[PDB]
Amino acid sequence: IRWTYARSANIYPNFRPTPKNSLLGAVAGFGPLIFWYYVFKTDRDRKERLIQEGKLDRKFNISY
């Protein structure tokens, strides 16, 4: 019971914001988001430029 309480209902009572966990929470909550945003944005703009320029070929792609 003490282990479950410490793991669940005590973390926010015993949390105090420091510079270290502020930086850690910022990077862990945003860096993956920014990274995957850039990956998907560059891929989708590449696909969009290819498909309006006409070089990308969808030979049998009708189940999009």
Partner 1 sequence: MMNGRPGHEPLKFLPDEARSLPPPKLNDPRLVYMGLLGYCTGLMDNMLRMRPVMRAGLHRQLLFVTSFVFAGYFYLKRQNYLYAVKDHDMFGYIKLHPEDFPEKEKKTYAEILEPFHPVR
Partner 2 sequence: MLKIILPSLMLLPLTWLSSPKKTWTNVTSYSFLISLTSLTLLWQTDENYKNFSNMFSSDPLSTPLIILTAWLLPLMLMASQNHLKKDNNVLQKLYISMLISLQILLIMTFSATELIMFYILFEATLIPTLIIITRWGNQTERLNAGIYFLFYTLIGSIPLLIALILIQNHVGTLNLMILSFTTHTLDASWSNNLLWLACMMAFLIKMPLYGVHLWLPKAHVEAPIAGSMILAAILLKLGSYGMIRISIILDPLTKYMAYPFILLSLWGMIMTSSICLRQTDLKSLIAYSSVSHMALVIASIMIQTPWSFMGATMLMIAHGLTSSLLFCLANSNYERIHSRTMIMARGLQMVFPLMATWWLMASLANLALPPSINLMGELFITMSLFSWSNFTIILMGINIIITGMYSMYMIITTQRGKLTNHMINLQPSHTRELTLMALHMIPLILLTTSPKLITGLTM
Partner 3 sequence: LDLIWLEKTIPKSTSTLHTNMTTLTTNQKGLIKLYFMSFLINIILIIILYSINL
Number of Cβ within 10 Å of residue 47's Cβ equals 11
* Residue from 3, 15, 60, 64 binding partner 1 (CB under 8 A): 64
CB of 5 to ligand 3PE, least distance (A): 17
- Residues 6 or more apart whose CB falls under 8 angstroms from that of 56 comprise 47, 50
How many residues line the site for ligand 3PE (CB under 6 A)? 6
Q: Which is nearer to ligand 3PE, 24 or 50 (CB)?
A: 24
How far separated are the first and last CA of the chain, in Å rounded?
51
Q: Give the separation between CA 37 and CA 44, rounded to whole angstroms.
A: 10
Q: Which positions touch partner 2 (CB under 8 A)?
A: 1, 3-4, 7-9, 29, 32-33, 36-37, 39-41, 43-44, 47, 61, 63-64
